[PDB]
Amino acid sequence: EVQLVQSGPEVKKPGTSVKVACKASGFTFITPVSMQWVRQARGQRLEWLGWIVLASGNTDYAQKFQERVTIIRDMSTSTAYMELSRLRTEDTAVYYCAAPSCSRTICSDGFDIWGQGTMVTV
Amino acid sequence: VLTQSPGTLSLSPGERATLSCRASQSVSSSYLAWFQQKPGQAPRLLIFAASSRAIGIPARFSGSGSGTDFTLTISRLEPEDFAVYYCQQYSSSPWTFGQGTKVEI
Amino acid sequence: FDEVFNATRFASVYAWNRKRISNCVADYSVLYNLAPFFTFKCYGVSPTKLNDLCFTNVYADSFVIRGDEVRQIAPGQTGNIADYNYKLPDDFTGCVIAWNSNKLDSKVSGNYNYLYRLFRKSNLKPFERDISTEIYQAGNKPCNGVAGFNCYFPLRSYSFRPTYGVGHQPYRVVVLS
């Protein structure tokens, strides 16, 4: 089965950085899969942060959080990371990774596999 | 900007829910998405590509619409369907969600 | 054979170059000057017989890949280079030659002039050459020639920097068939 397993909860101070891990299992990073990062502050809408191609390593970011967010991958551990710098109290959220259920040469047309979320408190 | 309506929808089990999503100033709606969220859970995909149902989603769920106006219909509500529903656009960076519609008993 | 081995610029592996060599005694003495990071591996032939056996037509295929990718240039292999850039047949009779080229083919900023195909709808046949730049559709919606969701540029550059570990450094490859 394909599964996304995130790192445990983080407590940070304002002005510091957080680095949330997502380990993917059950698919190879060789497929052109977009892994995405989305957050949710308590009782707020979903906010999309950005994404990474798991084969090429190209990223893009939402313009609001484009300067602070850095998404990277490690191909050897099958792990994406989302790093968020210059933390504010408004950055207190559950951070989710997500990816579409992909195959060797064919992707689904919606994003269906989510990690369990990582609570970040600031 | 996506705008959902209503903001809350109170309905009995067995009734038909109908939830709107309106795309505001811009469109290019070719990879439209729809989600359920339960308290303390991540969002689950229900409908993708405007109307295509996600794997393991019950036949009571159906999506429709194109351009500016989209609909999620639940043909007969079951007790596990009471949740917050979100729409979300794509190929329209930033990839925006609607504000949600709460369905409740 | 010097014009292939000592070529000032090699090809990108998705667009590998083929030279027919005919009526030449193959002086392999050029190969002794490529020690110390040299993979030489023959299939169906003894390496020692290549000096004496003047084959009426040899093909010398030439390209650049990473060090960790050199193992995919063999019969029966799978992987992104073997499947989508350069496939050998399983009855391959001939020789794979590869040497570290980090002094020639890296730059401090990165060299990016070497490309590889990262996606294709099907694996290559033996010695098939795909130079197409068409957007790879992974999804069930048309790309219309635009990169986007499930819509990828089929080719990618590496990065060849002098400071990379040996597995990420450029290797020039010549395959004789």
Author numbering:
A (entry chain B): 1 to 122
B (entry chain C): 3 to 107
C (entry chain A): 338 to 514
Per the authors:
ZCB11 targets viral receptor-binding domain specifically and neutralizes all SARS-CoV-2 variants of concern, especially with great potency against authentic Omicron and Delta variants. Cryo-EM analysis demonstrates that ZCB11 heavy chain predominantly interacts with Omicron spike trimer with receptor-binding domain in up conformation blocking ACE2 binding. NAbs target epitopes in SARS-CoV-2 receptor-binding domain (RBD), N-terminal domain (NTD), and quaternary regions. Accordingly, class I antibodies bind to the tip of RBD in the up conformation whereas class II antibodies recognize the ridge of RBD either in up or down configuration.
The spike-Fab complex showed three major states in the RBD region. In one state, all three RBDs presented “up” conformation (3 u). In other two states, only 2 RBDs exhibited “up” conformation and the remaining RBD showed “down” conformation (2u1d), despite a slight shift of the RBD region between two states. The “down” RBD did not bind to the Fab because its epitope was blocked by the neighboring “up” RBD, similar to previous findings on some class I and class IV antibodies. Structural analysis showed that the epitope in RBD interacting with ZCB11 partially overlapped with the ACE2-binding site, suggesting that ZCB11 is an ACE2 blocker similar to other class I antibodies. Furthermore, the binding of ZCB11 to RBM was mainly driven by the first interface by forming tight interaction through strong hydrogen bonds, including those formed between N477, K478, N487, N460 of RBM and D109, S108, R104 in CDR H3 or S34 in CDR H1 of ZCB11 heavy chain, respectively. In addition, the salt bridge, formed between R104 in CDR H3 of ZCB11 heavy chain and D420 of RBM further stabilized the binding of ZCB11 to RBM.
